[PDB]
Amino acid sequence: AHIFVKPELVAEIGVKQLQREIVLPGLVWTNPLTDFGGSKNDTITVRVPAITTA
Amino acid sequence: AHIFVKPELVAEIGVKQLQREIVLPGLVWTNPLDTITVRVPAITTA
Numbered sequence: 169a170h171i172f173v174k175p176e177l178v179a180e181i182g183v184k185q186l187q188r189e190i191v192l193p194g195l196v197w198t199n200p201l202t203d204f205g206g207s208k209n210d211t212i213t214v215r216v217p218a219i220t221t222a
Numbered sequence: 223a224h225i226f227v228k229p230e231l232v233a234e235i236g237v238k239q240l241q242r243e244i245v246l247p248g249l250v251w252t253n254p255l256d257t258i259t260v261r262v263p264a265i266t267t268a
Binding site: 200201203206207208211212213214215216217219 | 228229230231232233234235236237238239241
């Protein structure tokens with residue numbers, strides 16, 4: 169029978185892998201403490217004030 | 223290897239111990255002054 173030699177075409181019709189929408193990083197508390205360098209063991213230990221009872 | 227001398231930073235970021243909200247005082251009849259007496263007016267019949 170008739171046999172033809174043809175290329176193998178490749179196209180990008182816009183399909184892809186569906187992925188999550190980024191929401192979480194904009195919500196949590198980011199960077200209250202910055203000077204991690206210049207502190208022992210990379211720790212910026214936060215103080216919490218004292219309360220008392222009468 | 224390399225050794226650096228760094229201080230222990232202590233910073234306050236607004237985190238504080240959670241405390242109650244003062245609501246009850248001001249809703250109760252307070253009388254600044256040893257003791258005080260309150261006189262209730264008399265009522266009668268007819």
